[PDB]
Coordinates of C-alpha atoms and ligand atoms in Angstrom, one line a residue:
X925 CA 5.9 18.0 -6.9
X926 CA 3.7 14.9 -6.1
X927 CA 4.6 11.3 -6.1
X928 CA 2.2 8.5 -7.2
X929 CA 3.5 5.2 -6.0
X930 CA 1.7 2.0 -7.1
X931 CA 2.0 -1.5 -5.6
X932 CA 2.1 -4.5 -7.9
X933 CA 1.5 -7.8 -6.3
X934 CA 3.2 -11.0 -7.5
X935 CA 0.2 -13.3 -6.8
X936 CA -2.1 -11.3 -9.2
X937 CA -0.6 -13.5 -12.0
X938 CA -2.7 -16.4 -10.6
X939 CA -6.1 -14.8 -10.9
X940 CA -8.3 -16.3 -13.7
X941 CA -9.1 -14.8 -17.1
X942 CA -9.4 -11.1 -17.1
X943 CA -8.1 -10.7 -13.6
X944 CA -4.6 -12.1 -14.3
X945 CA -2.1 -9.2 -14.0
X946 CA 1.5 -9.3 -15.0
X947 CA 4.2 -6.5 -15.1
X948 CA 3.5 -6.1 -18.8
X949 CA 0.1 -4.9 -17.9
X950 CA 1.5 -1.8 -16.2
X951 CA 1.2 1.4 -18.2
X952 CA 4.7 2.9 -17.7
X953 CA 3.3 6.5 -17.8
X954 CA 0.8 6.0 -15.0
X955 CA 2.7 6.0 -11.7
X956 CA 6.0 7.9 -10.7
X957 CA 7.1 4.8 -8.6
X958 CA 6.2 1.2 -8.7
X959 CA 6.6 -1.2 -5.8
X960 CA 6.9 -4.9 -6.2
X961 CA 5.2 -6.9 -3.5
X962 CA 6.9 -9.0 -2.1
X963 CA 10.4 -10.4 -1.6
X964 CA 11.0 -12.8 1.3
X965 CA 13.9 -13.7 3.6
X966 CA 16.0 -16.9 4.2
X967 CA 18.9 -17.1 6.8
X968 CA 18.8 -13.3 7.0
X969 CA 19.1 -12.6 3.3
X970 CA 16.5 -11.2 0.9
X971 CA 15.1 -13.8 -1.5
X972 CA 12.4 -14.4 -4.1
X973 CA 9.1 -16.2 -3.2
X974 CA 7.4 -17.2 -6.6
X975 CA 9.1 -19.6 -9.0
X976 CA 9.0 -17.0 -11.7
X977 CA 10.0 -13.8 -9.7
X978 CA 13.3 -13.3 -11.6
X979 CA 11.4 -13.2 -15.0
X980 CA 8.8 -10.8 -13.4
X981 CA 11.6 -8.5 -12.0
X982 CA 13.0 -8.3 -15.6
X983 CA 9.7 -7.3 -17.1
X984 CA 8.9 -4.9 -14.2
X985 CA 12.3 -3.1 -14.1
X986 CA 12.2 -3.2 -18.0
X987 CA 9.3 -0.7 -17.9
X988 CA 12.1 1.8 -17.1
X989 CA 13.0 1.5 -20.8
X990 CA 9.9 3.1 -21.7
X991 CA 9.9 5.9 -19.2
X992 CA 13.3 7.0 -18.0
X993 CA 11.9 8.9 -15.0
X994 CA 10.1 5.8 -13.5
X995 CA 11.6 4.3 -10.2
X996 CA 11.0 0.9 -8.9
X997 CA 11.3 -0.6 -5.4
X998 CA 11.2 -4.0 -4.1
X999 CA 8.9 -4.5 -1.0
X1000 CA 9.9 -7.0 1.7
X1001 CA 7.5 -8.5 4.2
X1002 CA 3.7 -7.8 4.2
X1003 CA 0.8 -9.3 6.3
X1004 CA 1.4 -13.0 5.7
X1005 CA 5.1 -12.8 6.2
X1006 CA 4.6 -11.7 9.8
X1007 CA 7.4 -10.6 12.2
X1008 CA 9.5 -13.6 13.1
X1009 CA 12.2 -13.3 10.4
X1010 CA 12.4 -9.5 11.0
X1011 CA 12.8 -10.0 14.8
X1012 CA 15.6 -12.5 14.4
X1013 CA 17.3 -10.4 11.6
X1014 CA 17.4 -7.2 13.5
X1015 CA 18.4 -8.8 16.7
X1016 CA 22.2 -8.6 16.2
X1017 CA 24.5 -6.3 14.2
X1018 CA 25.9 -9.3 12.3
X1019 CA 22.3 -10.4 11.1
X1020 CA 21.6 -6.8 10.1
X1021 CA 24.9 -6.7 8.2
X1022 CA 24.2 -10.0 6.5
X1023 CA 20.8 -8.7 5.4
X1024 CA 21.9 -5.3 4.3
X1025 CA 24.7 -6.8 2.1
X1026 CA 22.2 -9.2 0.6
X1027 CA 19.9 -6.3 -0.3
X1028 CA 22.4 -4.0 -2.1
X1029 CA 23.5 -7.1 -4.1
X1030 CA 19.9 -8.2 -4.9
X1031 CA 18.7 -4.8 -5.8
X1032 CA 21.6 -4.0 -8.1
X1033 CA 21.5 -7.5 -9.7
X1034 CA 17.8 -7.2 -10.7
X1035 CA 17.7 -3.5 -11.2
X1036 CA 15.5 -2.1 -8.5
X1037 CA 16.0 1.6 -7.4
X1038 CA 15.3 0.8 -3.7
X1039 CA 13.7 -1.3 -0.9
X1040 CA 10.3 -0.7 0.8
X1041 CA 10.1 -2.3 4.2
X1042 CA 6.6 -3.7 4.9
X1043 CA 7.2 -5.1 8.3
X1044 CA 3.7 -5.6 9.9
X1045 CA 4.6 -4.5 12.5
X1046 CA 7.6 -3.8 14.8
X1047 CA 6.4 -4.2 18.4
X1048 CA 3.1 -6.2 17.5
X1049 CA 2.1 -9.6 16.1
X1050 CA 4.8 -11.4 18.2
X1051 CA 7.6 -8.9 17.7
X1052 CA 9.0 -7.9 21.1
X1053 CA 9.3 -4.3 22.4
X1054 CA 12.9 -4.0 21.5
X1055 CA 11.9 -4.2 17.8
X1056 CA 10.6 -0.7 17.8
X1057 CA 14.0 0.8 18.3
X1058 CA 15.8 -2.0 16.4
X1059 CA 13.7 -1.1 13.3
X1060 CA 15.2 2.4 13.5
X1061 CA 18.7 1.0 13.8
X1062 CA 18.1 -1.2 10.7
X1063 CA 16.8 1.6 8.7
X1064 CA 19.6 4.0 9.7
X1065 CA 22.2 1.4 8.9
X1066 CA 20.5 0.6 5.6
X1067 CA 20.3 4.2 4.5
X1068 CA 24.0 4.6 5.4
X1069 CA 25.1 1.5 3.6
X1070 CA 23.2 2.9 0.6
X1071 CA 25.0 6.2 0.9
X1072 CA 28.4 4.6 0.9
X1073 CA 27.5 2.2 -1.9
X1074 CA 26.5 5.2 -4.1
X1075 CA 29.9 6.8 -3.6
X1076 CA 31.8 3.5 -4.2
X1077 CA 30.2 2.7 -7.6
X1078 CA 29.2 6.4 -8.5
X1079 CA 25.5 5.9 -9.2
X1080 CA 22.6 7.5 -7.4
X1081 CA 21.9 5.9 -4.0
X1082 CA 19.3 3.1 -3.6
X1083 CA 16.2 4.4 -1.9
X1084 CA 14.8 3.2 1.4
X1085 CA 11.1 3.6 2.1
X1086 CA 8.6 1.9 4.5
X1087 CA 4.9 1.1 4.5
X1088 CA 3.7 1.9 8.0
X1089 CA 0.6 1.4 10.3
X1090 CA -2.5 3.5 10.5
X1091 CA -3.6 2.0 13.8
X1092 CA -2.7 4.4 16.7
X1093 CA -1.8 1.5 19.0
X1094 CA 0.3 -0.1 16.2
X1095 CA 2.1 3.2 15.6
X1096 CA 2.8 3.7 19.3
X1097 CA 4.4 0.4 19.8
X1098 CA 6.1 0.4 16.4
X1099 CA 7.9 3.6 15.4
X1100 CA 10.5 6.3 16.4
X1101 CA 8.8 8.7 14.1
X1102 CA 11.3 11.6 14.2
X1103 CA 14.3 9.3 13.8
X1104 CA 12.8 7.1 11.0
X1105 CA 11.8 10.2 9.2
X1106 CA 15.4 11.3 9.0
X1107 CA 16.5 8.2 7.1
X1108 CA 13.5 7.0 5.1
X1109 CA 13.0 8.6 1.7
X1110 CA 9.2 8.1 1.9
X1111 CA 6.6 6.9 4.4
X1112 CA 3.8 5.0 3.0
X1113 CA 0.9 5.2 5.5
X1114 CA -1.5 2.3 5.1
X1115 CA -4.6 4.5 5.4
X1116 CA -7.1 1.7 4.6
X1117 CA -8.6 -1.4 6.2
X1118 CA -9.8 1.2 8.7
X1119 CA -13.1 -0.7 9.1
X1120 CA -14.2 -4.2 8.0
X1121 CA -16.4 -7.1 9.1
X1122 CA -14.2 -8.1 12.0
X1123 CA -15.9 -5.1 13.8
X1124 CA -19.5 -6.5 13.5
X1125 CA -21.0 -3.4 11.9
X1126 CA -20.7 -1.7 8.4
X1127 CA -18.0 0.9 8.1
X1128 CA -15.7 2.4 5.4
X1129 CA -12.5 1.0 4.2
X1130 CA -10.8 4.3 3.9
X1131 CA -13.0 7.3 5.0
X1132 CA -11.4 10.7 4.7
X1133 CA -13.1 12.1 7.9
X1134 CA -14.8 10.6 10.9
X1135 CA -18.4 9.7 11.1
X1136 CA -20.4 12.2 13.2
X1137 CA -21.3 9.3 15.5
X1138 CA -17.7 8.1 16.0
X1139 CA -16.4 8.6 19.5
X1140 CA -13.5 7.4 21.5
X1141 CA -11.0 5.3 19.5
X1142 CA -13.4 5.0 16.6
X1143 CA -12.7 8.7 16.0
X1144 CA -9.1 7.8 15.0
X1145 CA -10.0 5.5 12.1
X1146 CA -10.0 8.0 9.2
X1147 CA -7.4 9.2 6.8
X1148 CA -7.4 12.8 8.2
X1149 CA -6.8 11.7 11.8
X1150 CA -4.1 9.2 10.8
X1151 CA -2.1 11.5 8.5
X1152 CA -2.3 14.4 11.0
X1153 CA -1.0 11.9 13.7
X1154 CA 2.1 11.0 11.7
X1155 CA 2.7 14.7 10.8
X1156 CA 2.1 16.1 14.3
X1157 CA 4.3 13.3 15.8
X1158 CA 7.4 14.1 13.8
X1159 CA 7.1 13.0 10.1
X1160 CA 7.7 15.8 7.6
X1161 CA 4.6 16.4 5.4
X1162 CA 6.7 16.0 2.2
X1163 CA 7.8 12.5 3.1
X1164 CA 4.3 11.3 4.0
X1165 CA 2.5 9.4 1.3
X1166 CA -1.3 8.9 1.7
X1167 CA -2.5 5.2 1.0
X1168 CA -5.4 4.9 -1.4
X1169 CA -7.1 1.5 -1.8
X1170 CA -8.4 0.3 -5.2
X1171 CA -10.6 -2.2 -3.5
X1172 CA -13.3 -2.2 -0.8
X1173 CA -14.4 -4.4 2.1
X1174 CA -17.8 -6.3 2.1
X1175 CA -20.0 -7.6 4.8
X1176 CA -23.0 -9.7 5.5
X1177 CA -25.8 -7.5 6.8
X1178 CA -27.7 -9.0 9.8
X1179 CA -30.9 -7.3 8.6
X1180 CA -31.2 -6.3 4.9
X1181 CA -33.5 -3.4 6.0
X1182 CA -30.7 -1.6 8.0
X1183 CA -28.2 -0.5 5.3
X1184 CA -26.6 2.6 6.8
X1185 CA -23.1 3.2 8.2
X1186 CA -22.8 1.3 11.5
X1187 CA -25.5 -1.3 10.6
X1188 CA -24.9 -4.6 12.4
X1189 CA -23.4 -7.5 10.3
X1190 CA -22.9 -11.2 10.7
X1191 CA -19.6 -11.7 9.0
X1192 CA -17.3 -11.1 6.0
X1193 CA -18.9 -10.7 2.6
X1194 CA -18.3 -13.2 -0.3
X1195 CA -15.0 -13.5 -2.2
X1196 CA -15.2 -12.1 -5.7
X1197 CA -14.7 -14.4 -8.8
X1198 CA -11.4 -12.8 -9.7
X1199 CA -9.3 -11.9 -6.5
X1200 CA -11.1 -14.7 -4.6
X1201 CA -10.6 -12.7 -1.4
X1202 CA -13.0 -13.2 1.4
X1203 CA -14.4 -9.9 2.8
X1204 CA -12.7 -7.9 -0.1
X1205 CA -13.6 -6.9 -3.7
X1206 CA -11.4 -5.3 -6.2
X1207 CA -12.7 -2.1 -7.7
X1208 CA -13.5 -3.9 -10.9
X1209 CA -15.4 -6.6 -9.0
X1210 CA -17.4 -3.9 -7.3
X1211 CA -18.3 -2.5 -10.8
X1212 CA -19.9 -5.9 -11.6
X1213 CA -22.0 -5.7 -8.4
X1214 CA -23.2 -2.2 -9.4
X1215 CA -24.1 -3.3 -13.0
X1216 CA -26.2 -5.9 -11.1
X1217 CA -28.3 -3.1 -9.8
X1218 CA -26.9 -2.8 -6.3
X1219 CA -28.2 0.3 -4.6
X1220 CA -25.6 3.1 -4.6
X1221 CA -25.0 5.1 -1.4
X1222 CA -22.8 8.1 -0.5
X1223 CA -21.5 8.5 3.0
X1224 CA -21.5 12.3 2.9
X1225 CA -19.6 13.0 6.1
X1226 CA -16.7 10.7 5.2
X1227 CA -16.8 11.4 1.5
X1228 CA -16.8 7.8 0.2
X1229 CA -19.4 5.6 -1.6
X1230 CA -21.0 2.4 -0.5
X1231 CA -23.4 -0.1 -2.1
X1232 CA -25.7 -2.9 -1.1
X1233 CA -28.0 -5.5 -2.3
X1234 CA -29.9 -8.2 -0.5
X1235 CA -27.7 -9.0 2.5
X1236 CA -24.4 -7.9 1.0
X1237 CA -22.9 -4.4 1.7
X1238 CA -19.6 -3.0 0.6
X1239 CA -17.7 0.3 1.4
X1240 CA -15.1 1.3 -1.2
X1241 CA -13.6 4.1 -3.1
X1242 CA -14.6 5.5 -6.6
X1243 CA -13.4 8.3 -8.9
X1244 CA -15.3 10.9 -6.8
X1245 CA -13.8 9.9 -3.4
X1246 CA -10.3 9.5 -4.9
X1247 CA -10.5 13.0 -6.4
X1248 CA -11.8 14.5 -3.0
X1249 CA -8.9 12.8 -1.1
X1250 CA -6.4 13.9 -3.6
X1251 CA -7.5 17.6 -3.3
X1252 CA -7.3 17.2 0.4
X1253 CA -3.8 15.8 0.3
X1254 CA -2.6 18.7 -1.8
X1255 CA -4.2 21.3 0.6
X1256 CA -2.4 19.6 3.5
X1257 CA 0.9 19.5 1.5
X1258 CA 1.6 15.7 1.7
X1259 CA 4.2 14.2 -0.6
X1260 CA 1.7 12.3 -2.7
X1261 CA -0.3 9.1 -2.9
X1262 CA 0.5 5.4 -2.7
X1263 CA -2.0 2.9 -4.2
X1264 CA -2.7 -0.7 -3.1
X1265 CA -2.8 -2.1 -5.7
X1266 CA -2.4 -1.5 -9.4
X1267 CA -3.8 -5.0 -10.2
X1268 CA -7.2 -4.2 -8.4
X1269 CA -8.0 -1.1 -10.3
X1270 CA -10.0 -1.6 -13.6
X1271 CA -6.9 -2.1 -15.7
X1272 CA -8.5 -3.6 -18.9
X1273 CA -11.1 -0.8 -18.8
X1274 CA -13.8 -3.4 -19.4
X1275 CA -15.6 -3.7 -16.1
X1276 CA -16.4 -0.1 -15.2
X1277 CA -16.7 1.7 -18.5
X1278 CA -14.5 4.5 -17.1
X1279 CA -11.3 4.0 -19.2
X1280 CA -8.2 2.1 -18.4
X1281 CA -7.1 2.4 -14.7
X1282 CA -9.9 4.7 -13.8
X1283 CA -8.9 5.1 -10.1
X1284 CA -5.2 5.5 -10.5
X1285 CA -5.7 7.8 -13.6
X1286 CA -7.9 10.1 -11.5
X1287 CA -4.9 10.6 -9.2
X1288 CA -2.5 11.2 -12.0
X1289 CA -4.7 14.0 -13.3
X1290 CA -5.5 15.4 -9.8
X1291 CA -1.8 15.4 -8.6
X1292 CA -0.9 17.4 -11.7
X1293 CA 1.2 14.6 -13.3
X1294 CA -0.8 14.4 -16.5
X1295 CA 2.1 16.2 -18.1
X1296 CA 4.8 14.0 -16.6
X1297 CA 7.3 13.0 -19.4
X1298 CA 6.9 9.3 -20.6
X1299 CA 10.0 8.9 -22.8
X1300 CA 12.8 6.3 -23.2
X1301 CA 16.5 6.9 -22.8
Ligands
DW0_1364 C1 2.3 -4.2 3.0 N1 0.9 -3.9 2.6 C2 0.5 -2.7 2.3 N2 -0.9 -2.7 2.0 C3 -1.3 -3.9 2.1 C4 -0.2 -4.7 2.5 C5 -0.4 -6.1 2.6 O1 0.5 -6.9 3.0 N3 -1.7 -6.6 2.4 C6 -2.0 -8.1 2.6 C7 -1.4 -8.9 1.5 C8 -1.8 -10.4 1.9 N4 -1.4 -11.4 1.0 C9 0.0 -11.8 0.9 O2 0.8 -11.1 1.7 C10 0.4 -12.8 0.0 C11 -0.6 -13.4 -0.8 N5 0.0 -14.3 -1.6 C12 1.3 -14.3 -1.3 N6 1.5 -13.3 -0.4 C13 2.9 -13.1 0.2 N7 -1.9 -13.1 -0.7 C14 -3.0 -13.7 -1.5 C15 -2.3 -12.1 0.2 O3 -3.5 -11.8 0.2 C16 -2.8 -5.9 2.0 O4 -4.0 -6.5 1.8 N8 -2.6 -4.5 1.9 C17 -3.8 -3.7 1.5
DW0_1365 C1 -9.0 -7.8 14.0 N1 -9.1 -8.4 12.6 C2 -9.6 -9.6 12.3 N2 -9.6 -9.7 10.9 C3 -9.0 -8.6 10.4 C4 -8.7 -7.7 11.5 C5 -8.2 -6.5 11.3 O1 -7.9 -5.8 12.3 N3 -7.9 -6.0 10.0 C6 -7.3 -4.7 9.7 C7 -5.9 -4.9 9.1 C8 -5.1 -6.0 9.9 N4 -5.3 -7.4 9.3 C9 -5.7 -8.5 10.2 O2 -5.9 -8.2 11.4 C10 -5.9 -9.8 9.7 C11 -5.7 -10.1 8.3 N5 -5.9 -11.4 8.2 C12 -6.3 -11.9 9.4 N6 -6.3 -10.9 10.3 C13 -6.6 -11.1 11.7 N7 -5.2 -9.0 7.5 C14 -5.0 -9.4 6.0 C15 -5.0 -7.7 8.0 O3 -4.6 -6.9 7.2 C16 -8.2 -6.9 8.9 O4 -7.9 -6.5 7.8 N8 -8.8 -8.2 9.1 C17 -9.1 -9.1 8.0

């Protein structure tokens, strides 16, 4: 009935000490689908990007030995990858053919159940206007090559899914929604990074509803607006997967006296000691900040927490907000939840004193998957 899709990132292995996260750290009963971020591309063919990716693939796909129902996908692209290889690859039927062949081969060789396209984004960040429609052609041709490959080797079809924009402008210049929706198995909407320090004021990473003071285009930066846009503009509810972030965005306050939503800010907040990401803290890093006696807030209109101390403020998601969004997604009949990322939840259980994978476990319980079988073949 609901999917729970979880991204695993292949650079989490480089975090120090308790933050290091490898495929073996994934509980195979937790998610219904796991997505490996990221593969890359070289002369129009899918390829690995870390020296040890093949060893990781093996361990990641090997979790399917513990839970025969689990599916895995490989994600290509992401933020840093940009758009240039995608633009060149989609630009001719030959480049597309080259790529699609490389993928069926890669995916079968290392035992993935599908590909998740994370092009960020067709039509933006240097990608020319023709890419909007070329992305559709790619996806159609891929879905079709998958259909024919399943008939000519008699196994179930590889899946094709896509992680897609939450920005209205990015959506508009990027996607033929009705057509994409025909050929994609799932649509993973990146409903997070909806606010952050680049804006110059405090704001939530992934608020469910708008702030009562949000007007004009600021009224579009919430999960409700974004998922309703996708749905009303042609995507079937059941293929639409709501993104949930297991991290939050932090800011430097311009005035440690003004600590509400919309308070002015002077820049990104500090990198955490584990993910080392400027302007971002993993949920387990934020739990450290809370133990440190940060003042806890609740943004009641948008249903998400925030916290602050001295001149550092952070808006994030906790068990409460994840539960609330998960009830909402069920009421609205979406297909399920996607989580970025499994390595940013409190996976050891030792930072938050809420059990192992508190955030993602909340979703497993709320989406009624507590009883999902976890048995080998
Ligand atoms: C598709 N997608 C869906 N949600 C996402 C992304 C995404 O790409 N990124 C941005 C991910 C940036 N990044 C990389 O891409 C990346 C990396 N190291 C190697 N790569 C290749 N790092 C340290 C990094 O930070 C996110 O932060 N989120 C929430
Ligand atoms: C306008 N801007 C400036 N910094 C930004 C943004 C922004 O819009 N977003 C919302 C999501 C898109 N995005 C960026 O734009 C972005 C970025 N790294 C550098 N930039 C520029 N990343 C990882 C990113 O995901 C960000 O996350 N960051 C950090």
